Design a protein around this nucleic acid. Sequence first.
RNA 1: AAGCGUUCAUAGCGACAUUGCUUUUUGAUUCUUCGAUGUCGGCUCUUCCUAUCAUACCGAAGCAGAAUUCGGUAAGCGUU
RNA 2: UGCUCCACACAAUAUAGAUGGAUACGAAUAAGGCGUCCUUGUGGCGUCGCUGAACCAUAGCAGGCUAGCAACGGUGCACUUGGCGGAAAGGCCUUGGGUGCUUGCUGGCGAAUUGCAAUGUCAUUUUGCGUGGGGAUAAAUCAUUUGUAUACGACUUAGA
Lengths: 172, 197, 136, 190, 106
Amino acid sequence: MAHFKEYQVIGRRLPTESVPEPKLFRMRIFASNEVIAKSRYWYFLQKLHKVKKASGEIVSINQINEAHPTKVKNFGVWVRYDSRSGTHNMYKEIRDVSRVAAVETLYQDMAARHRARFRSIHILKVAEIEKTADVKRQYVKQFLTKDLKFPLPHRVQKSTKTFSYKRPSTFY
Amino acid sequence: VEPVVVIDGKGHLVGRLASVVAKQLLNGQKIVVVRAEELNISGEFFRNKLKYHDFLRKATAFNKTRGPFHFRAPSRIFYKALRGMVSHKTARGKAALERLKVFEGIPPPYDKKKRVVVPQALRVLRLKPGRKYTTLGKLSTSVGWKYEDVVAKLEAKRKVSSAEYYAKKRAFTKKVASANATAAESDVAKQLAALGY
Amino acid sequence: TDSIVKASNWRLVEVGRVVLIKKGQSAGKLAAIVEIIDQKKVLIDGPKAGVPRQAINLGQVVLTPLTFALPRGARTATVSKKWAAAAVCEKWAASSWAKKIAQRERRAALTDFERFQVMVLRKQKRYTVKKALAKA
Amino acid sequence: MKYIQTEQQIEVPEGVTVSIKSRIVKVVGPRGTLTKNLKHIDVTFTKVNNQLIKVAVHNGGRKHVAALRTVKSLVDNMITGVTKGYKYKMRYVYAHFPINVNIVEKDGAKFIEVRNFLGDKKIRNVPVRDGVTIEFSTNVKDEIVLSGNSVEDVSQNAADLQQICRVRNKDIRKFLDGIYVSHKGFITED
Amino acid sequence: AESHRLYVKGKHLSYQRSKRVNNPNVSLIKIEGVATPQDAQFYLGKRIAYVYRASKEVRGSKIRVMWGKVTRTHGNSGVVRATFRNNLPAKTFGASVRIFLYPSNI
RNA sequence: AAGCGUUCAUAGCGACAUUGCUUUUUGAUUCUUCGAUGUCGGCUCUUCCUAUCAUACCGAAGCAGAAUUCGGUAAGCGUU
RNA sequence: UGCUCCACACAAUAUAGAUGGAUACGAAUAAGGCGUCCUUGUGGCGUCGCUGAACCAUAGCAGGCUAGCAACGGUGCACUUGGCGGAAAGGCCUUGGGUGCUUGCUGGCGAAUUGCAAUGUCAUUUUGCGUGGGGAUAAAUCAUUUGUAUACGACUUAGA
Ligand SMILES: [Mg+2]
Ligand SMILES: [Mg+2]
Ligand SMILES: [Mg+2]
Ligand SMILES: [Mg+2]
Ligand SMILES: [Mg+2]
Ligand SMILES: [Mg+2]
Ligand SMILES: [Mg+2]
Ligand SMILES: [Mg+2]
């Protein structure tokens, strides 16, 4: 469950004599590695089609890197999660430089704010919003203001030594 | 690295400073704490006064004289925090506790010795701004410590003499910095500058 | 008859603010804040000194008092052109903070002979200083 | 939530000067000097043009930006208190026993003495805090006026007198007797 | 000069131990001015003396020495594991040892 | 909260249901004690708890007063 | 021919652990320090921090002998002048003179054999002992005695 990567996993049913060349389904999977990526692919493909890992195969695994990794984007992540007493759909809006970093932020966010583990999260969709004012959350819209500036009061300075001779300051 | 390290207790969280002091004594360092009346505890005054009353009610039922001892002074409150982070029942623990002196205010000879702080334990560096805290002197007087006034009185007399001493030191370091200011641009000064000094 | 309020000047998190990386592969190099991601994370770029364009946590960098005019979201070439245009390198190098950084690096580069030379020079310099203190 | 910056304005009339260093606010105007220690709030004051003072909270939550608008009102009440002053108006409410309120000066302490409250032989004393002036307004029956420079001191004296005359062991909905505040206002409002 | 030191001061902290079982064969040593294991690699193999004194004269001197060497680093804070020819008296928990510059590679 | 309370569910109560707490009841168990822990009650004496009878200060009432009822802090002090 | 204080001579006794220096404002931290100036403020201006990675100190047979030059400083020892410090002051600031040393600069001589490393002994408590220089010349307990006390001890009294 490390620093996530996005995987382009394509799989299909095993071809038979009656119906060769099956429909060859594809999913985008956020996972720490390819082993989890294949496992997550089969899990979600169990929810949709009459298939399983024994009766199918994986034809392609491909890591998907960010097209523009070093430009800041606003992401709208649809997510379906299980709480202690029910399943809910919610929408989160995340501002960061990559889909993997946005998804990593949401896993931290859902665990912190809803105690929803990676176990009980279904990433419904990650879709970057192209235009400002189509953003819906005030906690990310406030960072899209013209000529945004802010200070960092009360800087805390770490000291290698256990004793200090100065009684330091928190200026910044 | 000093033979004796004097820690000015003001602005220090009690459990974070005493955990620092506990490791120093067990590592062989002599530690002296001053101004323990100015120590701090996270949480409201009433919350900390309630925790001391939960401590106050703990006593040996059949004889209160042989029971837990509820020391009211801030230096002894600090000492009780230290014990619990020191295996005080062993010979090594008693040797570590022999390396510590705590004081209300700054008595002699520590008045004219350099005091240090522990940024690893400072309230202004560890607490989040907007979090209520408590001063040990106010807490101690609320539970029966009898010498807040005389400590405050004798600290004022010490601070007046200390301020007068610093003025006679501000003047001397002003003259020393002026002599160093005119020493520049000489042959020796430019060689030291190229050598980082 | 005049209202007086101390402003308490702070370094601001802004586009074009020059930042010093204190932790990482750079660890002592300069960069410019290009985009503000959130309260804790900003996109920085330091192409003059070799800092790769990257999103970084504000807690592992320290803001310098230096600032220069830079558009929000500017790319690496635009930042590099306007970094040299604003002469950020020698404005940073003039600061006493950068002088002290160079003093510490030079001090750790002294050899045993060079440390001995500093000793003899310091004794020479202080002899005249003590003479100047005696007469003043 | 952690708002980036929340902002409140402070109007400064030309008659008063506001001197804020750290969080010690002093407001010197026509009527006097008022000082307030705000060293528990973590706000930032920014003077603009001798008539506008900006107060702001940087990276604050719900309970922090709520206290910011409180800081705005506290400094405004200092400004209002030193321009127009503060005046609180009582009424002596009673049914049978006439409440006899008077100003007594025992060893230079300036107490308010309240007698005959529901026939009580007890003499109720209410100290007048510094900076508050007490007047028994004429051309009106049973009224005492509390005037001063700080709304904090004037309203606390108002609550002190109102609370010293609480009815005990009776149906207070029937025994409505007591000194209550009937008007809150300024010295100069015509 | 006023300083004749040719060693680096160190403190004997404790033995190698779990929560409740120690190993007197290995001593944990804190070196002055060392804070990381990467910094503590300079002192591996260096000789450590524990210098103490006795009232009885043994071989012309009233000073006795216990010799050891740094074996490896310990933890993250620059503490080093040392092994001595005879284990430490265990009353020296918090005493001062002397870490020498030989065998010298730098 | 269906109703009672002249009208008004909740001043005071409260059906039909339902969630708990306690270990001063009695059941249920048989883990300890059968080379034995003296098995009822009272007297005497100390201490502890609060689920507060009185007392201190209060809040509510279908509290006009008097007297009551409900509720809070509270085991400091008494309870023959 | 007992006791105490000072000094130096020799023994024992040990070290919770010397190995250049514990190097002194106060307050705040959503603010401060330093310098400068004024109309003395909650003032203006400049500058600093981003750690003590500092500062001071530090060269010489474990630090010898000796010749000068520059300067009239630095620093040690005892001695002396005055003041301040009671929180546990027992320390800090000092005047003056004497006596050393000075690596601020330039010289001359010596070091070896601890043999390729062995802490290679340099510190500070305490207890005696001896020597020579001052200082003072008592009590307490038992026994007797009282009863403001008391099981016994103890307590409270009295006696040249
Ligand atoms: Mg413990
Ligand atoms: Mg007492
Ligand atoms: Mg009544
Ligand atoms: Mg270990
Ligand atoms: Mg059974
Ligand atoms: Mg028996
Ligand atoms: Mg109760
Ligand atoms: Mg020298």
